[PDB]
Amino acid sequence: VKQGPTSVAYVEVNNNSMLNVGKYTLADGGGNAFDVAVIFAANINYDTGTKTAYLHFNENVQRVLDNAVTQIRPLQQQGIKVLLSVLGNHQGAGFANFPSQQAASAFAKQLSDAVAKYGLDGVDFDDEYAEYGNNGTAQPNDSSFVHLVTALRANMPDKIISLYNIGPAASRLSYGGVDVSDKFDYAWNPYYGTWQVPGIALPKAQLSPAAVEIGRTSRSTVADLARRTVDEGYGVYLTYNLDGGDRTADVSAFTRELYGSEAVRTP
Amino acid sequence: MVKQGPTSVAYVEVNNNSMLNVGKYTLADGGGNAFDVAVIFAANINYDTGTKTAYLHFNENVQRVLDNAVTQIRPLQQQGIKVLLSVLGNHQGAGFANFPSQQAASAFAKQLSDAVAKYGLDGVDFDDEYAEYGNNGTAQPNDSSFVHLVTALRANMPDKIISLYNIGPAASRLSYGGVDVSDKFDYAWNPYYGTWQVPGIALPKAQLSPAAVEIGRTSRSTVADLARRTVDEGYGVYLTYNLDGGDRTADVSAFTRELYGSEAVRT
Ligand SMILES: [Mg+2]
Ligand SMILES: [Mg+2]
Ligand SMILES: [Mg+2]
């Protein structure tokens, strides 16, 4: 019954629980304050012996996935999609420097295998901390990310793929006559506290020019950025770092503008 | 063998890293410092509900760095590197923009100047985040508090450095009662790491850093691009944040090549 744009919440599972995303609803009965929860974050690692990238989960990320039944399914039951973000991890392998289509495809299978095993709704790409060049890896090239996303989308035609619009991967979305922009569901501004339209050939309904960090970004700014989201006709609103505290006022700061309603907490 | 180029600045999170790393990077051509200004991040503004009076608060690590200034600070100053103390909100309602009166703002300013002199610092940096205006029965930001505080502070230290992290309520409230305090600052920089945003402040370009980079997270190519744009366009400051204890020779040289025409070298 809620109508406005799609709300997104990155959660740093190293410090906080995914379930807090589901504790905020709209006073006027519209539904959840948040539409998408993102687990931050899995990693892309490099195995120097085999000279091969692989998907890696730290102790915290692995705990959330292993406990998907208490840590994920309840959000999904409420209607909240859950994604896994993937980040560089200082080992030289990154989303933009796969040496070949087959190599990018091997990684896509690992991502899609993880989405399937743990019942996830999709994946989010964050191309930072890769440290391209460590362990004798190559610098970014023009084809790696297009190959990777092309394979992932073929693997998961029904799942969400989203882009944290930063890093070398973000500027390499077209290769060999294929622009993979329409293979993403969403793209959003990575600079928390600011408004910045992603220059990506995706419709406005799937873009978040605004990005805020709950608990740090001024409530004045949260509200203004959500008002601009609606005013200019955009369809996504990115938030990061919701914790376990009482953020009713922080959340209401944008639910007031996105949905015309204030937020209430479940406990 | 002197260095010609914009003044580079290094925010150091002392909760995790030592100030001394800032002095560990010199230029391969001439041996000047890669970094001209180190900023201890960060002291706090607390409220104290009894007195109803804001006070300068140091956390365990900041207190340790200041108490041990002889080994953590003086070596940098003796190497020619100025050392500033950042001040940040701390969730207790008092912030730089909601002092109720000139007198109370002047009282907090005396605490800052006193601490500058006691520990032999070179000045103070303002970061107006996390204050949580309204907590403990505090007021919302007003138009006068920050002008009063900066006027009193500059009166206390005519010879010291006062810098502005360009974010938060205080950074839009620089004029009141016929007094514009823009020229009372020595520097003002973009808070949005990874980006280029010229502060809209009535300071000369030589005292502005539109560039902001996080060492170890911002891509080296972005570090270099922003450093090149700083020289082009003619700005006088280049802000870096979060230098750690690892070997960041390639990250530092990424900007020193463009700022000063020379690679950096560690130890
Ligand atoms: Mg689509
Ligand atoms: Mg395109
Ligand atoms: Mg700025």
Q: What DSSP letter does each residue of A84-150 carry, written as one string?
A: EEEE--SSS--TT--SSHHHHHHHHHHHHHHHHHTT--EEEEE--S--TTGGGPPPP-SSHHHHHHH
Under the phi-then-psi rule, with left for phi > 0, alpha for psi from -120 to 50, and beta for the rest, what region is B134?
Answer: left
The reply to whether A193 touches chain B by the CB within 8 Å rule is yes
Nearest to A120 by CA among A154, A172, A93, A158: A158
Helices and strands, counts by H and E, chain B: 7, 14
Whole-number Cα distances in Å, B154 to A212, B113, B194? 33, 9, 31
The token pair at B186 is 């020595």
Residues B20, B166, B169, B135, Cα dihedral to 10°: -20
Beta strand A178-179 with A174-175: parallel, antiparallel or unpaired?
A: antiparallel
Which DSSP string do the residues of A186-206 spell out, in sequence order? EEE--STTEE----SSS-GGG
Instruction: Decide: helix, strand or coil at residue A80.
Output: coil
The region, left, alpha or beta by phi > 0 then psi within -120 to 50, assigned to residue A29 is: left
Q: Is B265 on the interface with A (CB under 8 A)?
A: no
Whole-number Å distance, alpha carbon B93 to ligand 1 midpoint, is 45
- Please list, in sequence order, all residues whose beta carbon lies within 8 angstroms of the beta carbon of residue B121, skipping any fewer than 6 positions away: B40, B73, B83, B84, B85, B115, B160
- C-alpha span between B90 and B42 (Å, rounded): 10
- Do the beta carbons of residue A208 and residue A194 sit within 8 Å? no
How far is the CA of B244 from the CAs of A14, A92, A141, B207, B251, in angstroms? 21, 19, 29, 25, 11
CA distance B140 to B93: 9
Q: What do you get for the CA distance between the two ends of chain A, in Å?
A: 23
Which residue is associated with the tokens 């703002």? B105
d(CA A6, CA A25): 14
**Shortest CA gap B129–chain A (Å):** 7
Task: Quote the tokens at residue A132.
Answer: 């391209």
DSSP 8-state class, residue B236: S
| Side-chain-side CA neighbours of residue A99 (13 Å) | 8
> Can you give the residue ranges of every domain in chain A?
1-267
**Total residue count of chain B as it appears in this document:** 267
Q: Which of A89, A90, A97, A128 to mutate to test the interface with B (most CBs of B within 10 A)?
A: A128
Residue B248 three-state SS = coil
Helix, strand or coil, per DSSP, at residue B257: helix
Interface contact B217, partner A, CB < 8 A? yes
Beta bridge partners of B220: none
Q: How far apart are CA A222 and CA A212, in angstroms?
A: 6
Residue partners of A13: CB distance under 8 A and separation at least 6: A39, A40, A60, A61, A63, A64
CB B255 within 8 A of CB B238: yes
Q: A75 phi and psi, to 5 degrees?
A: -65, -45
Which residues from chain B sit within 8 angstroms of residue A128, using beta carbons?
217, 219
Cβ-Cβ contacts under 8 Å for A65 (sequence gap 6 or more):
A39, A57, A72, A84, A114, A118
Q: Which residues of B touch A220 (CB under 8 A)?
A: 169
Cβ-based neighbours of B63, under 8 Å, separated by 6 or more: none
- Spatial CB neighbours of A90, under 8 Å, sequence gap ≥ 6: A129, A130, A131, A134
> How far apart, in whole angstroms, are the C-alpha atoms of residue A248 and residue A254?
10
> 10 Å Cβ neighbour count for B263?
16
Task: For residues B150 and B154, give the distance between their C-alpha atoms in angstroms, rounded to a whole number.
Answer: 6
Residue with tokens 């709209």: A26
Are residues B239 and B189 in contact, defined by beta-carbon separation less than 8 angstroms?
Answer: yes
CB-CB contact of B96 with B128 (8 Å): yes
- B164, containing H or E segment: strand B161-165
Q: What is the DSSP letter of A21?
A: G
Query: Contact at 8 Å (CB) between A18 and A5?
Result: no
Question: What is the rounded CA–CA span in Å between residue A128 and residue A166?
Answer: 8
Q: Is the dihedral of CA B231, B232, B236, B238 positive or negative?
A: negative
Q: Return d(Cα B196, Cα B35) in angstroms, integer.
A: 20
Residues in a beta bridge with A39? A11, A84
CA distances from B53 to A250, B92, B130, B150, B173 (A): 26, 11, 18, 18, 21
Measure CA of the first residue to CA of the last residue in chain B; give whole Å: 19
A52 membership: H or E segment, kind and range: strand A52-56
Counting every residue, how long is chain A?
Answer: 267
Contacts of residue A174, defined as CB under 8 A and 6 or more positions apart, other chains included, come to A146, A180, A181
Put simply, the answer to whether A216 touches B129 (Cβ < 8 Å) is yes
- The answer to whether residues B147 and B104 touch, using CB atoms and an 8 Å cutoff, is no
Cα atoms found within 13 Å of the Cα of residue A123, Cβ hemisphere only: 30
Determine contact, residues B88/B124, Cβ cutoff 8 Å: no
Calpha distance A6→A235 (Å, rounded): 6
Per CB-CB distance under 8 Å, the chain A contacts of B95 are none
CA-based nearest distance A62→chain B, Å: 24
Before B188, cis peptide (omega within 30)?
A: no
